[PDB]
Amino acid sequence: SEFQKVVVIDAKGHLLGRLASVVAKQLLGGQKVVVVRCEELNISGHFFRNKLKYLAYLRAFHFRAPSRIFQKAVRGMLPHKTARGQAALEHLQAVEGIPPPFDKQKRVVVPAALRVLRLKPGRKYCTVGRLSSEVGWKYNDIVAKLEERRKVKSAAFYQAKLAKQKKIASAKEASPVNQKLSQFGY
Amino acid sequence: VNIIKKRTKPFKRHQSDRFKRVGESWRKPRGIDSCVRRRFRGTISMPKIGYGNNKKTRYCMPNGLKAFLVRNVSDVELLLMHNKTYAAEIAGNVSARKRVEIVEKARALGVKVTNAGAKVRSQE
Amino acid sequence: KYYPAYRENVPKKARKAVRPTKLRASLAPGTVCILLAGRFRGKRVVVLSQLEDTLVVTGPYKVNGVPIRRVNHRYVIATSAPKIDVSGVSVEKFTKAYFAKQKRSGPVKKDEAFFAENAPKNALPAERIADQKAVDAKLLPAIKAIPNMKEYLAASFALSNGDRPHLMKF
Amino acid sequence: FKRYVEVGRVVLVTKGEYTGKLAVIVDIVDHKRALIDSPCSEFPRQVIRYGSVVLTHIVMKLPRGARSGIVAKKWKAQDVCNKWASSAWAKKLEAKKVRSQLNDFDRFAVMRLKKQRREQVNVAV
Amino acid sequence: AQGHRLYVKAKHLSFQRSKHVIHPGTSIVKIEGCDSKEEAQFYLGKRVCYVYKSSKAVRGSKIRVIWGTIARPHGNSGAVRARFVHNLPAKTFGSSLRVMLYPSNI
RNA sequence: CUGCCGAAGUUUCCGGAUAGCAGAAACUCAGAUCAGUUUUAUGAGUAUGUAAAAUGAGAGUUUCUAGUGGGCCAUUUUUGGUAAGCAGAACUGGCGAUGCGGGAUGAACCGAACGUGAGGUUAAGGUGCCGGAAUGUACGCUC
RNA sequence: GCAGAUCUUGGUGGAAGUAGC
RNA sequence: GCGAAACCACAGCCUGGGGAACGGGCCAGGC
Numbered sequence: 001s002e003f004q005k006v007v008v009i010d011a012k013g014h015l016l017g018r019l020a021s022v023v024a025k026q027l028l029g030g031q032k033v034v035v036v037r038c039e040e041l042n043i044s045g046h047f048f049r050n051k052l053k054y055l056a057y058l059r060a061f062h063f064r065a066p067s068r069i070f071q072k073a074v075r076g077m078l079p080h081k082t083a084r085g086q087a088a089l090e091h092l093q094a095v096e097g098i099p100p101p102f103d104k105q106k107r108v109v110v111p112a113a114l115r116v117l118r119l120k121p122g123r124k125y126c127t128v129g130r131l132s133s134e135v136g137w138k139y140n141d142i143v144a145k146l147e148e149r150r151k152v153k154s155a156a157f158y159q160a161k162l163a164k165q166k167k168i169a170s171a172k173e174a175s176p177v178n179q180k181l182s183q184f185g186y
Numbered sequence: 187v188n189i190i191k192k193r194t195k196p197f198k199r200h201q202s203d204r205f206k207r208v209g210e211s212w213r214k215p216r217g218i219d220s221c222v223r224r225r226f227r228g229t230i231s232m233p234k235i236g237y238g239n240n241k242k243t244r245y246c247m248p249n250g251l252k253a254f255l256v257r258n259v260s261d262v263e264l265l266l267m268h269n270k271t272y273a274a275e276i277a278g279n280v281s282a283r284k285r286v287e288i289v290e291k292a293r294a295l296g297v298k299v300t301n302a303g304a305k306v307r308s309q310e
Numbered sequence: 311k312y313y314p315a316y317r318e319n320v321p322k323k324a325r326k327a328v329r330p331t332k333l334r335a336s337l338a339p340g341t342v343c344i345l346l347a348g349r350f351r352g353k354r355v356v357v358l359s360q361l362e363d364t365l366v367v368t369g370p371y372k373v374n375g376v377p378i379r380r381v382n383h384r385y386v387i388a389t390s391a392p393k394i395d396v397s398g399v400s401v402e403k404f405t406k407a408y409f410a411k412q413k414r415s416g417p418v419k420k421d422e423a424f425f426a427e428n429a430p431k432n433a434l435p436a437e438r439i440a441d442q443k444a445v446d447a448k449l450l451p452a453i454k455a456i457p458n459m460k461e462y463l464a465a466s467f468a469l470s471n472g473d474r475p476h477l478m479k480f
Numbered sequence: 481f482k483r484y485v486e487v488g489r490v491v492l493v494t495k496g497e498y499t500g501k502l503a504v505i506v507d508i509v510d511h512k513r514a515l516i517d518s519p520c521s522e523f524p525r526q527v528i529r530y531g532s533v534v535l536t537h538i539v540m541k542l543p544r545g546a547r548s549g550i551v552a553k554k555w556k557a558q559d560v561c562n563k564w565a566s567s568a569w570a571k572k573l574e575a576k577k578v579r580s581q582l583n584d585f586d587r588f589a590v591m592r593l594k595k596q597r598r599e600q601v602n603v604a605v
Numbered sequence: 606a607q608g609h610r611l612y613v614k615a616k617h618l619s620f621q622r623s624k625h626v627i628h629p630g631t632s633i634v635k636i637e638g639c640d641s642k643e644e645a646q647f648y649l650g651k652r653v654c655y656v657y658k659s660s661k662a663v664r665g666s667k668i669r670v671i672w673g674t675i676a677r678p679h680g681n682s683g684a685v686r687a688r689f690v691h692n693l694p695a696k697t698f699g700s701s702l703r704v705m706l707y708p709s710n711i
Numbered sequence: 712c713u714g715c716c717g718a719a720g721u722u723u724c725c726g727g728a729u730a731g732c733a734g735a736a737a738c739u740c741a742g743a744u745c746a747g748u749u750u751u752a753u754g755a756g757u758a759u760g761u762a763a764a765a766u767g768a769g770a771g772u773u774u775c776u777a778g779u780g781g782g783c784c785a786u787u788u789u790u791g792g793u794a795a796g797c798a799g800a801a802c803u804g805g806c807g808a809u810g811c812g813g814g815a816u817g818a819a820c821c822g823a824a825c826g827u828g829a830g831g832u833u834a835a836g837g838u839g840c841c842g843g844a845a846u847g848u849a850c851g852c853u854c
Numbered sequence: 855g856c857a858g859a860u861c862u863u864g865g866u867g868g869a870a871g872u873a874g875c
Numbered sequence: 876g877c878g879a880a881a882c883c884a885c886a887g888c889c890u891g892g893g894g895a896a897c898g899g900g901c902c903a904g905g906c
Contacts, residue, residue: 002472003614003637021840028840029616029635030699045854060905076904077840084698085841112839112846123854167603177597184590185578192827204885207857214712218808225810225825235714236826270316334710342585346707351611384708391585462588469610474638476647480584480711512850529849622843623812630829633843680838681845 006032010107012040016073016128018113024077027088036107039066039096039129039143042115047126054135064136066128067094096129097143098150189243189250197233247273251298258284259291266295273298282306331363337383342391342459343367344467344480350376352466356394356449359401366404370446370453373463378442380409387467389480392456399448403441483535488542490560491516495532498523500573502564503533504555507545519552519561538564613638615653615702617693621679621686629692634675636704639683651675652705653687655697675704 007026011019019041023033043050063069071094079085098107111117119125133140172178197212200222212233215223222229245252251273256262262274274297276288282305289302337343341357343365355369355376365383369376412432418424453459469475483489485508493501493516501523503516509527516533517525525548540558542551555561564570582590614637621631634653639645655671663669673689 001638001640003616018839018846021846024840028699029618030701049854074840079841081904118846171600171602172597174602175597175600177593181589181593183578184582184586184593185575186590186594190828201857205857212712227811229810233713234826236828238827267315336711344584346611346705346709352609384710387706387709387711389584391583458585458589458592461592462585465588466609467584467611468607469613470607475613475706476639476644477580479581531849619843624837624842626812627843679844681847684844 003029003031006034008102008105008107009033009035010109011035011037011070013115014041014110014113015115015118016041016043016070018118019110020070020073021077022110022113023092024074024088027074027078027091028084030091032091034093034095034102035067035070036095036098036102038070038094039127039132039140041066041070041128042119042125043128043131044115044119044123044125046124047131050126050131051134054131058135062136064132065096066132066137067096069128069132070094096139097147103150103154187243187250189246189248190240192237192239197231200230247300249273249298253300256280256288259287262288262292262295262297265292265297269295269297273300275300276302276304333360333365333383334388336388336390337365337386338393340394340396341388342394342463343389344387345376345381346385346387348381348385350379352468354389354463354465354467355381356396356453356463357388358396358399358445359404361404362406366401366409368442368445369463370449371442372446372450373453373460374466378404378438378445387480391462392459394449394459395452396449398452399445482537485511485514485530485535486539487544488540490536490538490540490564491533492536493528493533496528500577502536502560503528504540504542504551504560506542506551517546517548517551519555536564536569537567612703612705613648615704617655617697617700617702618684619698620695629695631676631686631688632673632693633679633684634687634702634704635684636675639685641683642678642681645678645683645685648675648685648704649677650708652707653689654703654705655689655693655700656703657697657700 009019009023019035023035026033063072071089071092074092074094075089078088080089095102115125129137129140129143196210198210199208199213200215200220202208202210214232217223222232225232247253252271253275254261254265254272255277256274257277257280265272265274274288274292276285276299280288285305289299292299292302337357337360339357339359342354343357345351345353345355345367350369353369353374353376355367355374357365357367358378359366360383361380363383364380365386366378367376367381367386368378371377416430423429453463485505487505487508490502490504493499493503501518501520503518503523505514506517506525507515509515513527513529514533515525515527517523538560540554540560542554546554565574616635616637618633618635621628621633636645636648639648651674653673653675655673657669657671658667659669660667671689671691671693673687673693676686676688678684679686
């Protein structure tokens with residue numbers, strides 16, 4: 001449906017293949033896509049299954065960061081040999097965690113890629129950041145530490161916004177104009 | 187009545203752009219193992235009678251007229267009755283002494299000239 | 311000069327007779343409609359009468375400043391706003407010749423404006439303003455009777471974010 | 481949980497030509513299909529799949545396999561109508577339905593209306 | 606603020622192509638906000654344009670427009686087929702477009 | 712340079728004379744015949760040939776005159792095989808003179824056989840992304 | 855009426871300012 | 876400082892598959 005000039009996507013609980021396919025199609029549509037929390041990406045299958053899949057890949061440059069793992073999946077779904085697919089890649093920014101510039105921006109999700117809406121209950125799935133922890137990535141511990149720090153600050157902002165929202169909500173019914181002409185569904 | 191051209195690009199000889207010794211003028215490819223003769227995908231087109239243009243609009247210039255080569259005033263007078271179908275075209279070897287008299291004669295006859303301003307200047 | 315000098319192939323007798331245009335059901339006189347194209351795009355105006363093909367339309371002069379103008383019926387969105395009383399204003403004077411562009415004429419002799427370019431200028435006659443001053447006189451009480459009509463026609467229609475023209479009703 | 485597939489639960493149809501209507505489960509054909517009915521005349525007794533419906537929180541006392549006439553009488557007796565409407569779910573849906581019909585003039589009157597309500601800002605005044 | 610925007614935003618996706626053959630005469634246009642072929646029927650026949658800019662200015666204006674018209678829907682997802690007066694360049698894939706509300710039948 | 716016709720790639724006797732295939736001319740015919748046709752029935756042994764209903768096409772010549780006078784693959788039939796494979800013949804078409812959509816790609820596979828174009832609709836194959844097209848519906852199976 | 859004939863004659867290149875003297 | 880000649884369709888990263896070699900051109904991947 002409606003689009004935006006730049007899109008920030010929260011990759012928590014999103015399947016790797018499903019999200020990458022939607023992102024790759026959006027990149028070829030000229031949109032600018034920024035994917036945050038790339039280390040919480042989920043892949044269907046046992047963590048043993050993906051460990052050997054990555055270990056087989058280890059046996060070019062074998063990138064270990066979860067963000068570069070996601071970029072590899074997106075890269076394969078683009079015509080990177082041509083200029084059109086080259087420009088699409090430069091319009092994508094995959095990062096782990098939520099950096100400050102995208103910290104205070106709305107983060108949308110893709111229901112077609114969400115694990116809960118796409119994976120059978122009880123199925124074993126592995127987290128990309130957790131999977132990448134035993135392949136060479138050594139920043140998982142600190143990335144989590146900033147994440148809780150960001151969550152505390154984000155929660156404090158939400159309480160301030162919620163407390164402020166209570167003021168307009170209380171004053172919403174105070175004005176008689178709301179009740180007088182609420183026949184329009186508003 | 188509008189002139190429709192089935193094609194505007196010329197038919198170049200195959201491999202004419204790789205060699206200077208091979209001219210651009212169209213030559214039918216006689217090679218049996220040639221991809222151009224067998225008309226594969228990506229191979230160039232060849233002159234076929236299907237490309238032939240409408241008989242009514244054949245030989246017609248984009249302005250709707252047919253060129254008529256003129257070497258003197260006597261040639262241009264022939265177009266007295268056919269001035270809405272033909273345009274006078276003075277030959278390249280006709281001197282400027284005769285080009286001016288052809289253009290003045292073609293003006294009274296109501297005949298378009300395709301190259302009326304050649305080898306002359308004006309003096310208002 | 312008169313006997314045909316050429317073959318002069320006469321056109322074959324065509325069988326395309328001119329029948330009146332069928333306007334839309336919702337393009338009735340007195341409908342508040344949005345102009346889609348032109349210099350007054352987005353302006354809401356009131357339909358006075360339907361011409362042979364176009365709509366003789368006008369926005370009230372003091373409301374949105376849209377003079378009595380022709381608009382093509384394909385370039386108009388007819389909103390479902392309440393109708394305006396237009397039976398009280400005569401519209402017989404609005405013909406094809408009334409809106410027709412004044413003939414480009416003037417026997418300008420050689421030089422002066424022909425060469426020196428001391429050209430004249432155009433100006434709308436008071437006759438057009440006189441007829442215009444009458445229509446808002448017979449229309450302003452009608453739009454004032456119902457609420458928000460004066461403010462409605464003053465505003466200009468626009469599309470906001472998340473507005474789907476196919477879904478939302480006009 | 482709060483919602484279970486049981487006889488007498490009021491469900492809301494969300495797919496097909498009966499989208500937005502209300503119905504009550506009468507029989508449990510299978511874990512994928514169920515038989516429903518409604519007191520409304522335009523809604524016939526039919527078998528529908530659970531993918532085309534969402535279960536509301538309203539549960540009403542029905543014997544298994546009740547006919548449409550008995551269901552309609554029980555529906556009126558248990559006052560199911562205007563009880564679902566009392567929920568904020570129906571009010572949100574009804575507001576959405578009324579909003580969809582709104583034309584341009586009503587939208588213009590709304591903008592002026594919400595413009596007046598906005599300037600109140602009587603917080604900390 | 607609030608601009609004018611008497612049009613609908615749209616994107617140029619690709620040409621009418623098979624796997625290996627392209628037809629630049631027809632372009633596939635995604636009118637964003639339209640999600641099915643039935644919804645696409647509203648926008649059939651509307652005037653679509655590609656507004657771009659060139660560094661050289663003509664008549665004191667640096668904006669150039671290629672006009673087109675939506676012909677028919679394409680697929681089940683509301684994408685439409687548009688034919689322009691000049692075939693759209695291949696480099697305008699993913700570029701924005703403007704779909705007017707005229708000609709109108711509402 | 713363009714356009715229109717257009718094979719054969721092999722019977723048979725034996726480098727050949729034939730023939731076949733493809734054209735030219737002159738003849739007589741549409742109330743005459745013909746067919747990689749299907750029948751009916753007679754017989755004969757589910758098939759078989761013959762004779763006489765449907766369907767389609769106007770048919771039969773005579774004369775002389777270019778080229779071919781390799782095969783590959785595939786289908787079916789096949790006889791023995793025999794580490795197992797396979798080999799051997801025969802049967803029949805396609806390619807060999809032929810581009811096009813699909814098949815990742817590919818000459819044998821699936822569709823389709825070609826003047827230059829606009830529009831429409833499909834075949835085979837497809838609709839997550841590369842890629843045009845449902846991250847369609849309804850059941851299940853699979854970790 | 856030419857693109858071919860390890861074609862004929864003439865001109866001219868890269869190898870190369872190289873091998874080298 | 877003086878100064879050739881052989882040779883010269885064009886080119887010049889791999890990995891596979893591509894049945895006829897196919898890798899140097901083709902198809903999917905890396906560079």
